[PDB]
């Protein structure tokens, strides 16, 4: 699709068999989701933004469908304000900015 | 133009009498610029990021050119590590997400 920006670009995602809403965020290097269980091993990591840093769990090579497009990549899990899809996955689904 | 998301989507903006690099940020409701001593009346505001809130100065009706496209709107100034173009201005320049 083509998505305009008068509202937050929230989309439905599927991950670990579960549906969630997430924010398409071209200002995020990485993908960060709200606290949840994901299968497999994770590594503790920290990520920063406005307001400073938070602790997250890094899961690698995690499948996620964003709209109906398939991605498999790094998903961080922690106390993000909102589910965020970052560039690492936006690139995988072929997402660009256009003006 | 079309901007790919392999790297941070940074572009040149012109605000007041300055050119700056700024991040085209679909994950930002508002536009937030690194500290600079802009003239004009302002109102205090607090904006939230992944790590918590920060204090900023809200300037209204500020002309700003983004990659040659003229816009005018609310610009927030404060201790952000990166200049951030938010949805408030991305809409004015006809910016979409596409995949």
């Amino acid at each position: 699709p083509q998505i305009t920006l008068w509202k937050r670009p929230l989309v439905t995602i599927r991950i670990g068999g579960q549906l969630k809403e997430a924010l398409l965020n071209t200002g995020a290097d990485d993908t960060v989701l709200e606290e949840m269980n994901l299968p497999g091993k994770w590594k503790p990591k920290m990520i920063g933004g406005i307001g400073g840093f938070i602790k997250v769990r890094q899961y690698d090579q995690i499948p996620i469908e964003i709209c109906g497009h398939k991605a498999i990549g790094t998903v961080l899990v922690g106390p993000t304000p909102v589910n965020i899809i970052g560039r690492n996955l936006l690139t995988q689904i072929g997402c660009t900015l256009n003006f | 133009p079309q901007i790919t998301l392999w790297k941070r989507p940074l572009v040149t903006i012109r605000i007041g009498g300055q050119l700056k690099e700024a991040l085209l940020n679909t994950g930002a409701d508002d536009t937030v610029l690194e500290e600079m001593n802009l003239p004009g009346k302002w109102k205090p505001k607090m904006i939230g990021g992944i790590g918590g809130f920060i204090k900023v100065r809200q300037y209204d009706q500020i002309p700003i050119e983004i990659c040659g496209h003229k816009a005018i709107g609310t610009v927030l100034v404060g201790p952000t590590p990166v200049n951030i173009i938010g949805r408030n201005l991305l809409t004015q320049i006809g910016c979409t997400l596409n995949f």
Binding site: N25, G27 | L23, N25, T80
Partner: peptide, 9 residues
């Protein structure tokens, strides 16, 4: 790495 979410409230 960095995640520049901005909540305008």
């Amino acid at each position: 790495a960095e995640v520049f979410y901005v909540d305008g409230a």
